[PDB]
């Protein structure tokens, strides 16, 4: 459920 990062 939104398990990722694009902007760190």
């Amino acid at each position: 459920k939104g398990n990722y990062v694009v902007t760190s």
Partner: antibody
Amino acid sequence: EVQLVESGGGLVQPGGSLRLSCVTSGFTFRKFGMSWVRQAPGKGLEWVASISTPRGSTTYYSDSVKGRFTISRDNSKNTLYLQMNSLRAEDTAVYYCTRGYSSTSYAMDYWGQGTLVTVSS
Amino acid sequence: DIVLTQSPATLSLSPGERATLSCMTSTDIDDDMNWYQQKPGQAPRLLISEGNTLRPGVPARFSGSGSGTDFTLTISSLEPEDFAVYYCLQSFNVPLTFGQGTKVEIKR
């Protein structure tokens, strides 16, 4: 306009290695997430890997390529890479460099023309 | 891994007709659905992004609707250049997953 230009594709024997490069223009590269998506001959689209912005410390891979492929970036060269090791026949496909459209999504807006990778003995 | 099921795999229509393309997901992905167009020999083009957001430059005849598990791409009136393959993509979770495509072809 935005341009993504892939290179480094070609013929390779099973078990071999290739490194794809994608040189970008038309936007501030360091500000965007980037992904590789591939398309096998006559087949649909399949996501391969994604990398965070700006440094690219955070990366994601499909199970099909986990442990074999490595995505990386060089912001000073506007370049995205895909290191492909231990290649197999089923890795044959056109490989697309793509840009994540937002600061929070890898959903692609711009795509390169793609580079063909053929794995065969 | 979230599965996207597109139907019908082939949509047979004539220019001028309304096209309805369906994408169903194996689980609730909120509104993180995206739609692409691909013509033979060409790279895909983004038509609609998360939240059924129409991309700048895309003709108004394209529109996305739905959320949760049932999504629809509508082409209000088909132009000759609209006959192509369309893919859906969920960007809710990794791995990012695509539908297997719907081909909009010429009926005769």
